[PDB]
């Protein structure tokens, strides 16, 4: 997310045993980094 020029990243890595979907259970992501980058973002694209 972007708030007032900070780009915030949260994450979680968790084991799964379901190829077909996201898990139905509960888990909370924790902050990775809080970048002061000051850009405008309206689009994005993953890198493979």
């Amino acid at each position: 997310k972007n708030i007032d020029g900070y780009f915030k990243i949260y994450s979680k890595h968790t084991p799964i045993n379901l190829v077909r979907d996201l898990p139905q259970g509960f888990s909370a992501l924790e902050p990775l980094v809080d970048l002061p980058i000051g850009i405008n973002i309206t689009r994005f694209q993953t890198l493979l």
């Binding site: 007032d4 020029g5 002061p36 000051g38 850009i39 405008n40």
Partner: peptide
């Protein structure tokens, strides 16, 4: 602070045009 001893010449190398947006 005033900087007329450093940043004047005029010195057209100095240019102008969200919070903390770097709108280059």
């Amino acid at each position: 602070w005033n900087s007329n001893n450093l940043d004047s010449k005029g010195n057209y190398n100095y240019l102008y045009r969200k919070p903390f947006e770097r709108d280059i």
